[PDB]
Scaffold this active site. Structure first.
Site, mmCIF file in Angstrom:
data_model
loop_
_atom_site.group_PDB
_atom_site.id
_atom_site.type_symbol
_atom_site.label_atom_id
_atom_site.label_comp_id
_atom_site.label_asym_id
_atom_site.label_seq_id
_atom_site.Cartn_x
_atom_site.Cartn_y
_atom_site.Cartn_z
ATOM 1 N N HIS A 41 73.912 38.050 -6.835
ATOM 2 C CA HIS A 41 72.467 38.137 -6.644
ATOM 3 C C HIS A 41 71.930 37.041 -5.683
ATOM 4 O O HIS A 41 70.756 37.097 -5.322
ATOM 5 C CB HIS A 41 71.685 38.219 -7.961
ATOM 6 C CG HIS A 41 71.633 36.957 -8.757
ATOM 7 N ND1 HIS A 41 72.203 36.878 -10.011
ATOM 8 C CD2 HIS A 41 70.979 35.804 -8.504
ATOM 9 C CE1 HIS A 41 71.914 35.668 -10.462
ATOM 10 N NE2 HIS A 41 71.179 34.986 -9.595
ATOM 11 N N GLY A 143 67.393 28.527 -10.532
ATOM 12 C CA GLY A 143 68.324 27.810 -9.671
ATOM 13 C C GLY A 143 69.604 27.406 -10.386
ATOM 14 O O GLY A 143 70.531 26.919 -9.733
ATOM 15 N N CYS A 145 71.756 29.483 -11.761
ATOM 16 C CA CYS A 145 72.795 30.506 -11.602
ATOM 17 C C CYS A 145 73.987 29.993 -10.841
ATOM 18 O O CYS A 145 73.842 29.143 -9.966
ATOM 19 C CB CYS A 145 72.246 31.785 -10.991
ATOM 20 S SG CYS A 145 70.696 32.328 -11.737
HETATM 21 C C1 LIG Z 1 69.504 31.745 -10.497
HETATM 22 C C2 LIG Z 1 68.409 32.762 -10.227
HETATM 23 C C3 LIG Z 1 67.335 32.678 -11.275
HETATM 24 O O1 LIG Z 1 66.751 31.626 -11.465
HETATM 25 N N1 LIG Z 1 67.077 33.788 -12.028
HETATM 26 C C4 LIG Z 1 67.346 35.109 -11.536
HETATM 27 C C5 LIG Z 1 68.572 35.726 -11.787
HETATM 28 C C6 LIG Z 1 68.807 37.014 -11.335
HETATM 29 C C7 LIG Z 1 67.836 37.719 -10.624
HETATM 30 C C8 LIG Z 1 68.058 39.171 -10.171
HETATM 31 C C9 LIG Z 1 68.109 39.277 -8.635
HETATM 32 C C10 LIG Z 1 69.361 39.754 -10.715
HETATM 33 C C11 LIG Z 1 66.913 40.049 -10.675
HETATM 34 C C12 LIG Z 1 66.624 37.085 -10.363
HETATM 35 C C13 LIG Z 1 66.375 35.799 -10.812
HETATM 36 C C14 LIG Z 1 66.406 33.688 -13.352
HETATM 37 C C15 LIG Z 1 66.322 35.010 -14.132
HETATM 38 O O2 LIG Z 1 67.331 35.516 -14.608
HETATM 39 N N2 LIG Z 1 65.100 35.506 -14.340
HETATM 40 C C16 LIG Z 1 64.880 36.703 -15.146
HETATM 41 C C17 LIG Z 1 63.785 36.480 -16.180
HETATM 42 C C18 LIG Z 1 63.594 37.758 -16.964
HETATM 43 O O3 LIG Z 1 63.281 38.866 -16.098
HETATM 44 C C19 LIG Z 1 64.337 39.108 -15.150
HETATM 45 C C20 LIG Z 1 64.570 37.906 -14.263
HETATM 46 C C21 LIG Z 1 66.820 32.533 -14.251
HETATM 47 C C22 LIG Z 1 65.864 31.768 -14.904
HETATM 48 C C23 LIG Z 1 66.244 30.871 -15.883
HETATM 49 C C24 LIG Z 1 67.589 30.760 -16.181
HETATM 50 N N3 LIG Z 1 68.539 31.473 -15.566
HETATM 51 C C25 LIG Z 1 68.144 32.326 -14.614
#
Ligand SMILES: *CCC(=O)N(c1ccc(C(C)(C)C)cc1)[C@@H](C(=O)NC1CCOCC1)c1cccnc1
Ligand SMILES: *CCC(=O)N(c1ccc(C(C)(C)C)cc1)[C@@H](C(=O)NC1CCOCC1)c1cccnc1
Lengths: 304, 304
Positions: A41, A143, A145
């Site tokens: 992602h 951030g 991930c």
């Molecule tokens: C590392 C990216 C990020 O911060 N997060 C994230 C992960 C994945 C996505 C996709 C592109 C797959 C949609 C987007 C953003 C978030 C995260 O997972 N946020 C979610 C919250 C609930 O609705 C869906 C998006 C992240 C935040 C906190 C901790 N870990 C990851």
């Protein structure tokens, strides 16, 4: 004496963390040998989140679009490929700090340490368990991930988890290092509800043995039970069924303390039925399930 | 989201751990620059434990009696001195992995990470707090002495604790890196009972703010209180008195959540008086006091 939620020393994993940027998204990568592993992602934008077609999005990316930085120095990307939900970025330099390592896919109930990172930099280390519903209750911000979960056996790091996302309920989902999610989760911004988060019975029993070894014995009773009787109570309390494999795994703890596994099950049964009555076990007012029998033995024996 | 008992990444400290042997006693040492620091009780035998005269025992020791091994390689000891309860062994080689460091003496209520070691090798890392009675509730077995406690600010490691002993009650005592014990403890096998282990009120409030930031809000009530009213309840429950300095320190958390510190005090007062009623806060059935306001801000902001 004393018993703590202990993580593995993180140094070997700190030496592998890098920053990966693609477009406007920056997350963490794991650099082992000449490959950097990161969540796929990283290629997604604001309009991709909801229903991304990773193969299509990846066509628009070249090696030079993946910016990999190890400390304050840039790594040259000479190849890229997608394996399930992870991207593998081949770089021209092997990580000189690559420890001996393995990629393992853990089972629910197993524990591991997480090195939470932001911008390729370690922020903290904590101990997790893969829940029976395949989520982890971590501490991850935007951030984080690409931060990884691991176990260490002497000098070999077994990587078992890579963080990908947070569900709307505040629990976490990720993959093994082959890019396969634990559980049914998908790397998409969609309705993904987790299943029943049951308690890891064998881990609770291991922690009750740790409590006895540490002098916390008030909960020991004059009763015994059978696997079938105990399991009727375990089902009622959303505890995982205990099998003979779990009894066997608790063998060293039963041997060290002289408390038969089924007698400890009867103690756990009374704790479930009567509660703690405002008392504590190893400084906890609830039954801890994120210590495996192996973790208890390791901590109580001082394995380095 | 999520909130975990998080330790600092331990790599910088792992690079400093060495094994120190004197006679038949082997414990850990901390190698910074060309000095190895270790508990002075490394010079004690079975008959010394009860009433050791460290100055007299040290007269019988020469540089060659201190065996220092960093990994599988021996360090040459060219000097030795006793500073309070620690020995400083000057070696002929500066530790090439010496991080930027400071020696700090922490106050009760402050938290730190411990890298538990055996034979100079790291076994695990966990987060501790210096209790108000100057003990720490760690996880240390025989041979863990010389393991250290530390905090990290970006790239500077502030060492604050060195493990020396376990009291007969299973709690731990140690020194700062100048060899001065925290509290009234002495490195002698004698009756040393700890004082009242009161709860670190400002830390509990910081953790209640962490809970609100993380969505756990059931405990928020419609009440407020005053510092004097709250402190009458805190005294009754063996909680440390809350001062205006603590209110000021909680300022950023109060600002982020919009919950006035005294309103959170009123929530804490009701939790003390009514109990949890079988409910949990951040996965705990008791009020957690080993997170400082700084730890909450750091974890909730992702400082690396
Ligand atoms: C590392 C990216 C990020 O911060 N997060 C994230 C992960 C994945 C996505 C996709 C592109 C797959 C949609 C987007 C953003 C978030 C995260 O997972 N946020 C979610 C919250 C609930 O609705 C869906 C998006 C992240 C935040 C906190 C901790 N870990 C990851
Ligand atoms: C590292 C040495 C060790 O294992 N322990 C220890 C420490 C200090 C002494 C002296 C010489 C000062 C008496 C001896 C042994 C023990 C320890 O502190 N044991 C105590 C148990 C209660 O009675 C007094 C001796 C140790 C065990 C577990 C954890 N940390 C230290």
């Amino acid at each position: 004496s004393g018993f703590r939620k202990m993580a593995f020393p993180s140094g070997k994993v700190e030496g592998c963390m890098v920053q990966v940027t693609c477009g406007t998204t920056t997350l963490n990568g794991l650099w082992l040998d000449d490959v950097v592993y990161c969540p796929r992602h990283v290629i997604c934008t604001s309009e991709d989140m909801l229903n991304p077609n990773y193969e299509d999005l990846l066509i628009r990316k070249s090696n030079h679009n993946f910016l990999v930085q190890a400390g304050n120095v840039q790594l040259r990307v000479i190849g890229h490929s997608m394996q399930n939900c992870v991207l593998k970025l081949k770089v021209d330099t092997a990580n000189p700090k690559t420890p001996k390592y393995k990629f393992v896919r853990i089972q629910p109930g197993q524990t591991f340490s997480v090195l939470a990172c932001y911008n390729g930099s370690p922020s903290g280390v904590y101990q997790c368990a893969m829940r029976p519903n395949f989520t982890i209750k971590g501490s991850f911000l935007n951030g984080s991930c690409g931060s990884v979960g691991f176990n260490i056996d002497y000098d070999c790091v077994s990587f078992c988890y890579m963080h990908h996302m947070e569900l709307p309920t505040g629990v976490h989902a990720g993959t093994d290092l082959e890019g396969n999610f634990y559980g049914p989760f998908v790397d998409r911004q969609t309705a993904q509800a987790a299943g029943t988060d049951t308690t890891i019975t064998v881990n609770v029993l291991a922690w009750l043995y740790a409590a006895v070894i540490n002098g916390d014995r008030w909960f020991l009773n004059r009763f015994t039970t059978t696997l079938n009787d105990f399991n009727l109570v375990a089902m009622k309390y959303n505890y995982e069924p205990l099998t003979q494999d779990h009894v066997d795994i608790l063998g060293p703890l039963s041997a060290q303390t002289g408390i038969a596994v089924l007698d400890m099950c009867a103690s756990l049964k009374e704790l479930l039925q009567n509660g703690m009555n405002g008392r504590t076990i190893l400084g906890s007012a609830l039954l801890e399930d994120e210590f495996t029998p192996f973790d208890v033995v390791r901590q109580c024996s001082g394995v380095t």
